[PDB]
Design a binder for these strands. Structure first.
Ligand SMILES: Nc1ncnc2c1ncn2[C@H]1C[C@H](O)[C@@H](COP(=O)(O)OP(=O)(O)OP(=O)(O)O)O1
Ligand SMILES: [Mg+2]
Ligand SMILES: [Mg+2]
Lengths: 553, 398
DNA sequence: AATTCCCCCCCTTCGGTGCTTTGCACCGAAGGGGGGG
């Protein structure tokens, strides 16, 4: 029934009226389902008949519920939402079973008719008016208005969550030794005490809820393991995701590729080693969601690997506050990382992957730091404490990186682990000039009208060469000049440039880039054994740097 | 109460609450539980569209958690600040005092009720561990701590309690920026503490800085006998940039030995023209640049740089290439902790000197800063910071 | 050619912003997908 809880005062945005949308022609089965539903609801006072005094209207339809033989009646409140006042949602995240503790007794409850058991503000009911049609336009239609929270309204979820919290507060105040994970209307009540006392307390909770209108039907009340909770199968000592079925097709469209990447990201939290880089690359540049895309022999290998991985049943474990959180990170190549958070060896609380590509140019250390931050900020949410990392990076490499980088870098308490692919810096630029090495005065120019440029590398011993470039801006010509200086040189080399752009790219030791020129720079830099890069102001009378300026111009 | 109002045509704070550590949550639902019994805060629902981040900080050797609300955004749109808008207008003699002390008048703001039509903006949400329950929303009934309008309202209650104290001791200058009392005396340190407890006793009954050690750090050129081609090349670049900040620097006598396509590790034969130009340019760098004046109509900008081995460097300025103050913070392992301590020291120096927190430009990635900056913060106020990515050009500040 | 609403996540695209280097690198919002109620 309708709860005696107080009604949250809602109002429209200033200067806005109510919706006046018209009803679409509905199908016969949906019309019959709506008429059947809007009769039981009307008898219980959840909706009320109206007439000419109400000029508002909003389309209504009915989708099929997750369980068959039941219809969910929704209202297309898309013009009312544009005029409703703003809300601050109180749901800040999603509970995870890895953060649960090992409770001796567990019960999962589901409130029946969750939204239709919370009253709606009396001054806001006139706007939520709708019109059930008559079948074959026999009658002109029956108009109703909502006395409870509508489904499809912007403010309904927050209002219901706050009402449920207020309802549950006295019970949790009386019983502080019982854990209750609430998510909308799904309740996970876990506690100590034997099965008899736990069932007695569950009955007390159900009576308390029934005193507040909310009813918990016996069909949605689970008392024995496994418990289907929030997409997971909670067990007494482990947990698992509900079975994931990947699409199996011989012709892949654009839309069905992202219906496979999405189900792999979800599966990549208890399943270790899931990669979606090659599959996701297939979505770059596509236009239509029905465009057939052929697999590129690299997405097929990833698909086979992920299909093999999903074939073995894996399980998680529950949190233990009297134990230490450990997180291991491993490299996968091409900027992909796989991490697992555990407390005991070979018993993972959680798994995950990080493959985001931030910035045009990067290296392994920066991506490892980003993965560390992501894991830290996720573990803070789930367990409320940072874990101890076991990174695949040497202490000396991290030291040489953070004591020489021009940015503040820190990662928490961490221990080096030696598991093949290691994070390292491929090349380093010497801070001092190298004696007995040819000094390379490079420059590059490009007219900003016809997109023609030239590069020059005139050096100490007398060597010089000017190379023309087509369709290059003022920066690509400089990068080409550096590339050509690096190419025609021995092992030890000193390169002096006149702009900050190339230095800023090169100084932060990139090992992979989104531009082919910087990539060629990187593969050349690793080949050399000693490189010294220096800056010089361009048009300040500096000979050599000015001699090459004439050469490139 | 006072009719607090926002700027013409401004909505209000709508910031998302960041996740908190389990220690900062167990010690935040306890503070807020007791704060609600006394009526300081009250529960609200989702019908209030506004929000503000909240977190707890354990102050210096206090062994107690203190709730801190990041009112940075609400300060920007409040703009009431009219009741004695000056807020104890900045005494120019505060920076010249031998020693000043910072005292936190915290529980004094929790006695004057906040205007009813304003408590909706001072709303915050307390997160839950593993999202067990939806966040608990609260709003302030009394004047909050950290909001710029709290000192501006409590002004005609602190100038009265301090009246029988600062009248007996005219040689003490007391400043209150946001929530802290900057009492700047001039006596001996031993007598300074005695003069502090008397003020503390005065505060109770009626309900360690040293600004004498601050100076600007100028750019210094190296002094070496052997001069290689690279060395002049670095100096020319440094002098070329130094010209725009130190007008009158000439490089004609120095941008002449770099003429040609010679080597870069050979020793240059320094001439008399360069030698005279070197000494002349050094003397201009000796005296700090004059002609710069603080304009209270424009906001200050800070710029921290990392120099390694724990050394940092900042340049507080209002317009580019016109520095009002430069300094070097030494080390006090951790990198974010040092930067966090650097921001507090610069902010404390800026408040003492100009009374305004500068707009910082941190040399750190955003995701690294927001993850850890609340762990080492220990000050009531929070400055507005912007993140930058600029490699060191020519090492032009150290 | 079906039409709804909130929350978290990932992946790609496009426009705005800042510095100057009138291109180029970053960032955030919006589209798609997954999961939950
Ligand atoms: N597709 C949806 N569109 C709009 N609101 C939804 C949707 N799914 C769920 N909700 C909201 C409204 C529901 O009242 C609330 C709880 O979901 P759910 O438990 O599935 O429904 P219910 O409690 O109304 O019916 P039941 O009797 O089957 O429990 O979540
Ligand atoms: Mg359900
Ligand atoms: Mg239900």
């Amino acid at each position: 029934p309708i709860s005696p809880i107080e009604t949250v005062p809602v109002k429209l945005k200033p200067g806005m009226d109510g919706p006046k949308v018209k009803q679409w022609p509905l199908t016969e089965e949906k019309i019959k389902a709506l008429v059947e539903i809007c009769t039981e609801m009307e008898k219980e006072g959840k909706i009320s008949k109206i007439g000419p005094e109400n000029p508002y209207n909003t389309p209504v339809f009915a989708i099929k519920k997750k369980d068959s033989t039941k219809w969910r009646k929704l209202v297309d409140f898309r013009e009312l939402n544009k005029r409703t006042q703003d809300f601050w949602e109180v749901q800040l995240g999603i509970p995870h079973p890895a953060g649960l503790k090992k409770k001796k007794s567990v019960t999962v409850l589901d409130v029946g008719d969750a939204y239709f058991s919370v009253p709606l503000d009396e001054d806001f009911r006139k706007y939520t008016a709708f019109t059930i049609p008559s079948i074959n336009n026999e009658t002109p239609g029956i108009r109703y208005q909502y006395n409870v929270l509508p489904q499809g309204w912007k403010g309904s979820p927050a209002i219901f969550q706050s009402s449920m919290t207020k309802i549950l507060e006295p019970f949790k105040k009386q019983n502080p030794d019982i854990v209750i994970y609430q998510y909308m209307d799904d309740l996970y009540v876990g506690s100590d005490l034997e099965i008899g006392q736990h069932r007695t307390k569950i009955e007390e909770l159900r009576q308390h809820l029934l005193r507040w209108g909310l009813t918990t039907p016996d069909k949605k009340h689970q008392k024995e393991p496994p418990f289907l909770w929030m997409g997971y199968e909670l067990h007494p000592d482990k947990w698992t995701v509900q079975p994931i079925v990947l699409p199996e097709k011989d012709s892949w469209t654009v839309n069905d590729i992202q219906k496979l990447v999405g189900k792999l990201n979800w599966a990549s939290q208890i399943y270790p080693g899931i990669k979606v880089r090659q599959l996701s690359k297939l979505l770059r540049g596509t236009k239509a969601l029905t465009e057939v895309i052929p697999l590129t022999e690299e997405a097929e290998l990833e698909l086979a690997e992920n299909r093999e991985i999903l074939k073995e049943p894996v399980h998680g474990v529950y949190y233990d506050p009297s134990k230490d959180l450990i997180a291991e990170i491993q490299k996968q190549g091409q900027g992909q990382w796989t991490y697992q958070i555990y407390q005991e060896p070979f018993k993972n609380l959680k798994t995950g992957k990080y493959a985001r590509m931030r910035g045009a140019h990067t290296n392994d250390v920066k991506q490892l730091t980003e993965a560390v931050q992501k894991i830290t900020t996720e573990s803070i949410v789930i367990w409320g404490k940072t874990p101890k990392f076991k990174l695949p990076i040497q202490k000396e490499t991290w030291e040489t990186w953070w004591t020489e980088y021009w940015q503040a870098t820190w990662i928490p308490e961490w221990e080096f682990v030696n598991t093949p692919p290691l994070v390292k810096l491929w090349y380093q630029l010497e801070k001092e000039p190298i004696v007995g090495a040819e000094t390379f005065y490079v420059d590059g120019a490009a007219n900003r009208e016809t997109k023609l440029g030239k590069a020059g590398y005139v050096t100490n011993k007398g060597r010089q060469k000017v190379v023309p470039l087509t369709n290059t801006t003022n920066q690509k010509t400089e990068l080409q000049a550096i590339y050509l200086a690096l190419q025609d040189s021995g092992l030890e080399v000193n390169i002096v440039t006149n702009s900050q752009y190339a230095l800023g790219i090169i100084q932060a030791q990139p090992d992979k880039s989104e531009s082919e020129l910087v990539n060629q720079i990187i593969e050349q830099l690793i080949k050399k054994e000693k490189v010294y890069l220096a800056w010089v102001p361009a048009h300040k009378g500096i000979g050599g740097n000015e001699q090459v300026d004439k050469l490139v111009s | 109460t006072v009719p607090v109002k926002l700027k013409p045509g401004m909505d209000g704070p709508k910031v998302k609450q960041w996740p908190l550590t389990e220690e900062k949550i167990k010690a935040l639902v306890e503070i807020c539980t007791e704060m609600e019994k006394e009526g300081k805060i009250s529960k609200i629902g989702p019908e209030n569209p506004y929000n503000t981040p909240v977190f707890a900080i354990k102050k210096k050797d206090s062994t107690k958690w203190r709730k801190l609300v990041d009112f940075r955004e609400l300060n920007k749109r409040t703009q009431d600040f009219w009741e004695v808008q000056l807020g104890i207008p900045h005494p120019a003699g505060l920076k010249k005092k031998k020693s000043v002390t910072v005292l936190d008048v915290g529980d004094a703001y929790f006695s004057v009720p906040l205007d009813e039509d304003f408590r909706k903006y001072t709303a915050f949400t307390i997160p839950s561990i593993n999202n067990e329950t939806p966040g608990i929303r609260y709003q302030y009934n009394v004047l909050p701590q950290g909001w710029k309008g709290s000192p501006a309202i409590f002004q005609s209650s602190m100038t009265k309690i301090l009246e029988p104290f600062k009248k007996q001791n005219p040689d003490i200058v007391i400043y209150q920026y946001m929530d802290d009392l900057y009492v700047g005396s001039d006596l001996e340190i031993g007598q300074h503490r005695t003069k502090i407890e008397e003020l503390r006793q005065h505060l109770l009954r009626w309900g360690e800085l040293h600004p004498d050690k601050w100076t600007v750090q100028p750019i210094v050129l190296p002094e070496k006998d052997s001069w290689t081609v690279n060395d002049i090349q670095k100096l020319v670049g440094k002098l070329n940039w130094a010209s725009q900040i130190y007008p009158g620097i000439k490089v004609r006598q120095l941008c002449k030995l770099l003429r040609g396509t010679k080597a870069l590790t050979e020793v240059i034969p320094l001439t008399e023209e360069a030698e005279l130009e070197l000494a002349e340019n050094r003397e201009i760098l000796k005296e700090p640049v004059h002609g710069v004046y603080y304009d209270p109509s424009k906001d200050l900008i800070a710029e921290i740089q990392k120099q390694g081995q724990g050394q940092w460097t900042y340049q507080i300025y209002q317009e580019p290439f016109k520095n009002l103050k430069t300094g070097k913070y030494a080390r006090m392992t951790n990198d974010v902790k040092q930067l966090t301590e650097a921001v507090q020291k610069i902010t404390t120096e800026s408040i003492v000197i100009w009374g305004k927190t500068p707009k910082f430009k941190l040399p750190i990635q955003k995701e690294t800063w927001e993850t850890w900056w609340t762990e080492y913060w220990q000050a009531t106020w929070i400055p507005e910071w912007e993140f930058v990515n600029t490699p060191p050009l020519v090492k032009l500040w150290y």
